[PDB]
């Protein structure tokens, strides 16, 4: 019997976790680049485009080279520049393939005959 009631105390948690955190190490990833190749053309060797199309006909598809002949003809009509038809050619055929045809264009046969103008050769003698 006869209580006194010891009242509510006011402590709490205080031995809390360590608060430190990392930002250690490094990070990064990427790649970007651009490359090409070019050479001048001497006058002596022989590589006209209308013959070049007949030398790749074994290496192209018939409706794919039908397009090339059309894109080359509208270059001649000044609808397009030479370099712009070449930029839409090297996506169809390829400039490595172009290079590999040059040696065959240098293998090609030719002739430029004339019909026989002179046939006389008999004896020039006189005073017989």
UniProtKB/Swiss-Prot annotation:
Residues 110-128 have a biased composition (Basic and acidic residues). Residues 40-111 form the RST domain. Residues 7-43, 108-128 are annotated as: Disordered. Interacts with the transcription factors NAC013/NTL1 and NAC046. Interacts with dehydration-responsive DREB2 proteins and a number of transcription factors belonging to several protein families. Interacts with turnip crinkle virus (TCV) movement protein P8. Disruption phenotype: Small plants, altered leaf shape and early flowering. Plants lacking RCD1 show enhanced resistance to methyl viologen, tolerance to freezing and supplementary UV-B irradiation, reduced sensitivity to abscisic acid, ethylene and jasmonate, increased sensitivity to ozone and up-regulation of reactive oxygen species scavenging enzymes. Inactive ADP-ribosyltransferase that functions with SRO1 to regulate oxidative stress, hormonal and developmental responses. Required for embryogenesis, vegetative and reproductive development, and abiotic stress responses. May regulate several stress-responsive genes. Seems to play a larger developmental role than SRO1. Does not bind NAD in vitro. Induction: By ozone, salt stress and cadmium. This is Inactive poly [ADP-ribose] polymerase RCD1. The chain holds residues 468 to 589 of 589 of the full protein. Residues 20-42 have a biased composition (Polar residues). The gene is RCD1. Coiled coil: none annotated. Plants overexpressing RCD1 show a weak rcd1 mutant phenotype. Expressed in young developing tissues, such as young leaves and flowers and root tips. In mature plants, expressed in vasculature of leaves and roots, and guard cells. It is found in: Nucleus matrix. The lineage of its organism: Eukaryota, Viridiplantae, Streptophyta, Embryophyta, Tracheophyta.
């Amino acid at each position: 019997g006869s209580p006194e009631f010891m009242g509510v105390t006011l402590e709490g948690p205080k031995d809390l976790p360590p608060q430190l955190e990392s930002n250690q190490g490094a990070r990064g990833s990427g790649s970007a680049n651009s490359v090409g190749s070019s050479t001048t053309r001497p006058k002596s060797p022989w590589m006209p485009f209308p013959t070049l199309f007949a030398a790749i006909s074994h290496k192209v598809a018939e409706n794919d080279m039908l397009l090339i002949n059309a894109d080359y003809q509208q270059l001649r009509d000044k609808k397009m520049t030479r370099a712009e038809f070449v930029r839409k050619l090297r996506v169809i055929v390829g400039d490595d393939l172009l290079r590999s045809t040059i040696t065959t264009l240098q293998n090609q046969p030719k002739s430029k005959e004339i019909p026989g103008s002179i046939r006389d050769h008999e004896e020039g003698a006189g005073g017989l």
